[PDB]
Design a protein around this ligand. Structure first.
Ligand SMILES: CC(=O)Nc1nnc(S(N)(=O)=O)s1
Ligand SMILES: [Zn+2]
Ligand SMILES: [Zn+2]
Ligand SMILES: [Zn+2]
Lengths: 160, 155, 160
């Protein structure tokens, strides 16, 4: 139809030795990893929040509590797929997703297509409606010092 | 019709003693509050900027350099100027970033306030909240950030 | 048509002595400037990213290598125009652009209308479809300390 809605999402996680690096469902060879409840997939969290926002359904925290047994130990791709099911049942179809990863290292460009493929699979979208961008923070802040990684997302949906 | 536009907004304010904490028009009990020339409702400022941006009307600094007015009156006036340019608001989405206090119990009230100020049904307004994972000035409780996205149409 | 897409962009550059300060294509008189391989125009880079992301064409680094000697000192308006040409080649028309600059200094209000005119010219848009906003970071973080300048952007396009 013509009942479009937009949503936006943000997420950040600390970057310290000890954990694997998983961004967009992709396990990336690195010395440090992202600290969170589960995989701490900062990119999928931001996209999930953008989708809930576009549907005016709250946020990732109110749908998938860390305490909730039904999502104990679920990984962020499963959360993303459950997010999309709720978006559909509210009557919305996803038109496109765009996103940015901000990280001082490692280089993420080799893994962009893998992330796009995971996200498009999880959302049941054609590949050319999913986009992921990645850049450094020019050595500024806790991002520029490699203490964390941030993700931003935007989503467009339409009531159908 | 089909002349859609998007806008994006961003704001941050310092948390300081002696001021009340007002986010999305909701007074939240807390030892500190937001500093600003206005009442410093950082969430309403981000949404205001996103609405000015979507209508290509400039920004909040150019519209409201209204002395003593609160951020809801300024949001109402923002919505008036967006309508004055010929735009209708289709939806608003937003995020609050604050290490403390807990905002989850106040989200539905903020959403109700924004919908009334923008003359929008509840289901076209969304507010999200999270922490900054103890990173940077937000993670140290020194400020609270808000982000907003708005879709308008010119019919 | 009705095939709408949204994109979002982010950029930051350090503010250093001995560099021109070029934001939105405007050379702003100032003792410091933005540091980058190109002219480091943080606002146009953010808008460029939003446009590539809306068209699902990747990001600015994919399209214009930030290490290639041919882009040393590159005019970021020329990069923006080539971005818009590639977005058009992918079948997309640009409907509007919104953006924000975050800086402690200098005062950008005298220059914002000129930046908007530059972006509108590069995107072949009327002025009423381009918006540039400017604010401080309320004294917080490296932005509050004047160590860099941030830009944010959003773009709506449609596949014809
Ligand atoms: C030629 C040129 O400028 N290329 C760029 N690639 N990435 C950039 S960014 N991270 O500053 O937006 S600029
Ligand atoms: Zn997260
Ligand atoms: Zn403010
Ligand atoms: Zn840049």
């Amino acid at each position: 139809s013509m009942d479009f809605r937009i949503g936006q999402g943000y997420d950040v996680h600390q970057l310290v030795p000890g954990r694997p690096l998983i961004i967009g469902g992709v396990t990336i060879p690195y010395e440090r990893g992202l600290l969170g409840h589960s995989d701490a997939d900062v990119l999928l969290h931001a996209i999930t929040d953008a989708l809930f926002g576009a549907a005016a359904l709250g946020d990732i925290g109110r749908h998938f509590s860390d305490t909730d047994p039904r999502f104990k130990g679920a990984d962020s791709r499963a959360l993303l797929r459950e997010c999309a099911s709720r978006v559909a049942q509210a009557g919305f179809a996803i038109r496109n997703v765009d996103s940015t990863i901000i990280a001082q290292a490692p280089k993420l460009a080799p893994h962009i297509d893998a992330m796009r493929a995971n996200i498009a699979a999880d959302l049941d979208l054609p590949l050319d409606r999913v986009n992921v961008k990645a850049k450094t923070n020019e050595k500024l802040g806790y991002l520029g010092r490699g203490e964390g990684i941030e993700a931003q997302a935007a989503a467009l949906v339409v009531r159908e």
